[PDB]
Coordinates of C-alpha atoms in Angstrom, one line a residue:
Chain A
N1 CA 73.2 132.1 173.5
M2 CA 73.2 129.9 170.4
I3 CA 76.4 131.9 169.5
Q4 CA 78.0 131.0 172.9
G5 CA 77.1 127.4 172.7
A6 CA 78.1 127.2 169.0
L7 CA 81.6 128.8 169.4
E8 CA 82.2 127.1 172.8
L9 CA 81.7 123.9 170.9
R10 CA 84.0 125.0 168.0
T11 CA 86.6 125.9 170.7
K12 CA 86.8 122.5 172.3
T13 CA 89.4 120.0 171.5
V14 CA 89.4 116.1 171.6
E15 CA 91.7 116.3 174.8
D16 CA 88.7 118.1 176.5
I17 CA 86.1 115.5 175.3
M18 CA 88.1 112.2 175.1
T19 CA 87.7 109.4 177.7
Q20 CA 91.1 109.0 179.4
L21 CA 93.3 106.2 178.7
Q22 CA 93.4 105.0 182.3
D23 CA 89.5 104.8 182.3
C24 CA 89.4 103.0 178.9
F25 CA 89.0 99.1 178.7
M26 CA 91.8 97.7 176.4
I27 CA 93.2 94.2 175.8
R28 CA 96.7 92.9 175.3
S29 CA 97.4 91.5 172.0
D30 CA 99.0 88.3 173.4
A31 CA 95.8 87.5 175.1
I32 CA 94.0 84.2 174.5
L33 CA 90.1 84.2 174.6
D34 CA 89.2 81.8 177.3
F35 CA 86.0 82.0 179.5
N36 CA 87.7 84.4 181.8
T37 CA 88.9 86.9 179.0
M38 CA 85.7 86.4 177.0
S39 CA 83.5 86.8 180.1
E40 CA 85.4 90.0 181.0
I41 CA 85.1 91.4 177.4
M42 CA 81.4 91.0 177.6
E43 CA 81.0 92.4 181.1
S44 CA 83.1 95.4 179.9
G45 CA 80.0 96.4 177.8
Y46 CA 82.3 98.2 175.2
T47 CA 81.5 97.4 171.5
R48 CA 84.9 98.5 170.3
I49 CA 88.0 97.4 172.5
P50 CA 91.5 98.6 171.5
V51 CA 94.2 95.9 171.0
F52 CA 97.8 97.1 172.0
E53 CA 101.2 95.4 171.8
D54 CA 103.6 95.5 174.8
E55 CA 103.2 98.9 176.4
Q56 CA 99.7 100.2 176.7
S57 CA 100.3 103.3 174.7
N58 CA 101.2 101.3 171.4
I59 CA 97.7 100.3 170.0
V60 CA 98.1 97.9 167.0
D61 CA 94.6 96.6 166.4
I62 CA 90.9 97.0 167.2
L63 CA 88.5 94.3 168.3
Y64 CA 84.7 94.4 167.5
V65 CA 83.2 92.4 170.1
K66 CA 80.5 91.0 167.7
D67 CA 83.4 89.3 166.1
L68 CA 83.7 87.0 169.4
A69 CA 80.3 85.4 168.5
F70 CA 81.3 82.1 167.4
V71 CA 84.6 81.8 169.5
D72 CA 84.5 78.9 172.0
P73 CA 86.5 79.5 175.1
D74 CA 87.3 75.8 175.1
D75 CA 89.2 76.3 172.0
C76 CA 91.1 79.0 173.6
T77 CA 92.1 80.4 170.3
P78 CA 94.2 83.6 170.8
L79 CA 92.9 87.0 170.0
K80 CA 96.2 87.3 168.0
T81 CA 94.5 85.2 165.3
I82 CA 91.7 87.8 165.1
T83 CA 93.6 90.9 165.1
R84 CA 96.3 89.7 162.8
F85 CA 93.3 88.8 160.6
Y86 CA 91.7 92.3 160.4
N87 CA 94.4 94.8 160.8
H88 CA 91.8 97.7 160.8
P89 CA 93.3 101.1 160.1
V90 CA 94.2 102.7 163.3
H91 CA 92.7 106.2 163.5
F92 CA 95.2 108.8 165.2
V93 CA 94.4 112.4 166.0
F94 CA 96.3 115.4 167.2
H95 CA 95.2 116.4 170.9
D96 CA 94.5 120.1 169.6
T97 CA 92.0 119.0 166.8
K98 CA 88.8 120.9 166.8
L99 CA 85.6 118.9 166.6
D100 CA 84.4 120.1 163.2
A101 CA 87.6 118.8 161.5
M102 CA 87.1 115.5 163.4
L103 CA 83.6 115.3 162.1
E104 CA 85.2 115.8 158.7
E105 CA 87.5 112.8 159.3
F106 CA 84.3 110.8 160.3
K107 CA 82.4 111.9 157.3
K108 CA 85.1 110.8 154.9
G109 CA 84.6 107.3 156.3
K110 CA 87.3 106.9 158.8
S111 CA 86.8 104.6 161.8
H112 CA 84.3 106.0 164.3
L113 CA 86.9 105.4 167.1
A114 CA 90.0 107.6 167.3
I115 CA 93.1 107.6 169.4
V116 CA 94.4 110.8 171.0
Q117 CA 98.1 111.7 170.5
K118 CA 100.3 114.6 171.9
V119 CA 103.9 115.4 171.0
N120 CA 105.8 115.0 174.3
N121 CA 108.9 117.1 174.6
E122 CA 109.6 116.0 178.3
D123 CA 113.9 113.9 171.0
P124 CA 110.2 114.5 171.3
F125 CA 107.9 111.4 171.2
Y126 CA 104.2 110.8 170.6
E127 CA 102.3 109.8 173.6
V128 CA 98.8 108.3 173.8
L129 CA 96.3 110.2 176.2
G130 CA 93.3 108.2 175.6
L131 CA 90.4 107.8 173.2
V132 CA 87.5 109.8 171.6
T133 CA 84.8 108.6 169.4
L134 CA 82.1 110.0 167.1
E135 CA 79.6 109.4 169.8
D136 CA 81.5 111.6 172.2
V137 CA 81.5 114.3 169.4
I138 CA 77.8 114.3 168.8
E139 CA 77.2 114.1 172.6
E140 CA 79.1 117.3 172.9
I141 CA 77.0 118.7 170.1
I142 CA 73.6 118.1 171.7
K143 CA 74.9 118.9 175.4
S144 CA 76.6 122.2 174.6
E145 CA 73.8 123.8 172.5
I146 CA 71.4 123.3 175.3
Chain B
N1 CA 80.0 121.4 159.9
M2 CA 79.1 121.3 163.6
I3 CA 76.2 123.5 162.8
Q4 CA 75.1 121.2 160.0
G5 CA 75.2 118.3 162.2
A6 CA 73.3 119.9 165.1
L7 CA 70.7 121.4 162.6
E8 CA 70.1 118.0 160.8
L9 CA 70.1 116.6 164.3
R10 CA 67.1 118.7 165.3
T11 CA 65.1 118.6 162.0
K12 CA 65.0 114.8 161.2
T13 CA 62.3 112.7 162.9
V14 CA 63.3 109.2 163.5
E15 CA 60.6 108.2 160.9
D16 CA 62.9 109.6 158.3
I17 CA 66.0 107.9 159.6
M18 CA 64.2 104.7 160.3
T19 CA 64.5 101.2 158.6
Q20 CA 61.0 100.1 157.6
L21 CA 59.6 97.0 159.3
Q22 CA 59.1 95.0 156.2
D23 CA 62.9 95.3 155.5
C24 CA 64.1 94.6 159.0
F25 CA 65.8 91.4 159.9
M26 CA 64.0 89.9 162.9
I27 CA 63.9 86.5 164.5
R28 CA 60.9 84.5 165.9
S29 CA 61.1 83.9 169.6
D30 CA 60.7 80.1 169.2
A31 CA 63.5 79.9 166.7
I32 CA 66.4 77.6 167.7
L33 CA 70.0 78.1 167.4
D34 CA 71.3 75.5 164.9
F35 CA 73.9 76.1 162.2
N36 CA 71.5 77.8 159.6
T37 CA 70.1 80.1 162.2
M38 CA 73.7 81.2 163.7
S39 CA 75.0 81.5 160.3
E40 CA 72.0 83.8 159.3
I41 CA 72.5 85.9 162.3
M42 CA 76.2 86.3 161.6
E43 CA 75.9 87.2 157.8
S44 CA 73.0 89.6 158.8
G45 CA 75.6 91.9 160.4
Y46 CA 73.1 93.2 163.1
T47 CA 74.6 93.5 166.5
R48 CA 71.0 93.8 168.2
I49 CA 68.2 91.6 166.6
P50 CA 64.6 92.2 167.4
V51 CA 62.7 89.2 168.7
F52 CA 59.0 88.8 168.0
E53 CA 56.1 86.6 168.8
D54 CA 53.3 85.8 166.4
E55 CA 53.1 88.7 164.0
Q56 CA 56.2 90.6 163.0
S57 CA 54.5 93.7 164.7
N58 CA 54.5 92.3 168.3
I59 CA 58.2 92.7 169.3
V60 CA 58.4 91.0 172.8
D61 CA 62.3 90.9 173.2
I62 CA 65.7 92.0 172.1
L63 CA 68.7 89.8 171.3
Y64 CA 72.2 91.4 171.8
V65 CA 74.2 89.2 169.4
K66 CA 77.3 89.4 171.5
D67 CA 75.6 87.3 174.2
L68 CA 75.6 84.4 171.6
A69 CA 79.3 84.0 172.3
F70 CA 78.5 81.5 175.1
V71 CA 76.3 79.5 172.9
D72 CA 77.3 76.7 170.6
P73 CA 75.0 75.7 167.6
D74 CA 75.5 71.9 168.1
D75 CA 73.4 72.2 171.3
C76 CA 70.3 73.4 169.5
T77 CA 69.6 75.9 172.1
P78 CA 66.3 77.8 172.1
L79 CA 66.4 81.4 171.5
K80 CA 63.7 81.6 174.2
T81 CA 66.2 80.3 176.9
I82 CA 68.5 83.3 176.0
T83 CA 65.9 85.9 175.9
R84 CA 64.5 84.5 179.2
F85 CA 67.9 84.4 180.6
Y86 CA 69.0 88.0 179.9
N87 CA 65.7 89.6 179.9
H88 CA 67.1 92.7 177.8
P89 CA 64.8 95.8 177.7
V90 CA 62.6 96.9 174.6
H91 CA 62.5 100.6 173.7
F92 CA 59.6 102.2 172.0
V93 CA 59.6 105.8 170.8
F94 CA 57.0 108.1 169.1
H95 CA 57.4 108.8 165.5
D96 CA 57.6 112.4 165.9
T97 CA 60.8 112.2 168.2
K98 CA 63.6 114.3 166.8
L99 CA 67.0 112.7 166.6
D100 CA 68.8 114.4 169.2
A101 CA 65.9 113.5 171.9
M102 CA 66.5 110.0 170.7
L103 CA 70.1 110.3 171.6
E104 CA 69.0 111.5 174.9
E105 CA 66.9 108.3 175.3
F106 CA 69.7 106.0 174.3
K107 CA 72.1 107.9 176.5
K108 CA 70.0 107.2 179.4
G109 CA 71.3 103.4 179.2
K110 CA 68.3 102.1 177.2
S111 CA 69.0 99.5 174.4
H112 CA 70.6 101.1 171.3
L113 CA 67.6 99.7 169.2
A114 CA 64.3 101.7 169.5
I115 CA 60.8 100.8 167.8
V116 CA 58.9 103.6 166.3
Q117 CA 55.4 103.9 167.0
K118 CA 52.5 105.8 165.4
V119 CA 48.9 106.5 166.6
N120 CA 46.3 104.9 164.1
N121 CA 42.9 106.5 164.0
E122 CA 41.7 104.9 160.8
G123 CA 39.6 102.0 162.0
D124 CA 39.3 101.5 168.8
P125 CA 42.3 103.3 167.7
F126 CA 45.6 101.6 168.4
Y127 CA 49.5 102.2 168.4
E128 CA 51.2 101.1 165.1
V129 CA 54.7 99.7 164.7
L130 CA 56.4 101.5 161.7
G131 CA 60.0 100.1 162.0
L132 CA 62.9 100.6 164.2
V133 CA 65.7 103.1 164.6
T134 CA 69.3 102.4 166.1
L135 CA 71.9 104.7 167.7
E136 CA 74.1 103.8 164.7
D137 CA 71.3 104.9 162.3
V138 CA 71.2 108.4 164.1
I139 CA 75.1 108.8 163.9
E140 CA 75.2 107.7 160.3
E141 CA 72.4 110.3 159.4
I142 CA 74.6 112.9 161.2
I143 CA 77.8 112.2 159.0
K144 CA 75.9 112.1 155.7

């Protein structure tokens, strides 16, 4: 039993865990932080929000919502200021990657949020299927062993 | 790797993971939101701050720092107004609770900060507040 849960964990990929891109809450890099955008970001509940340029599949920066604390919606400062400030390293991963290697990347200090990419032959280009995070990994651990 | 994470997940008690109370960053519930207060909350780096009344051991509320988005410090807004307005839940947990079980409690939708309680027989017995443990604390203790 412990064996089956263990290797069933070890056999999953990020594709099988990751929240799908269409169910993720993202934000356009051009966006300005006004009461509507701000309120939306809060109401979303996500602590880390992807910031993408143009097409949804190209993710430039990452927004930590605690950083919106002092932003006043009356100043209407664009999120572009914030993301162009940070330039957090974006974390990319192959869709076939096993969870143990993922846990290695997280142990080495990489961003706890990671973006799932697959080579699309349909020249081949890299498409973004969605997002997986360390919390999803550990969730799979404690779920699958029981 | 996965095995190491699961095993360390089921051995460690939240007491081992926890941040002691004396070293916590808390805020009194009567505090007001002027520049020193907001600047302190910002430089603390905590995303969820415990809110207490009288002694530090009595933790009445929780402040999600992101709420503070809609406050301005020139208003001198009482933290009591915010705490009464959102009414966020406080989470208590037994000092013997294993880490994975704690992940189950947080996963149920409870606040991602949890207060660790011990039973104290040493002088009528009472429940004792040792500190707090956060979901982030748990995950960090898995990757180390």
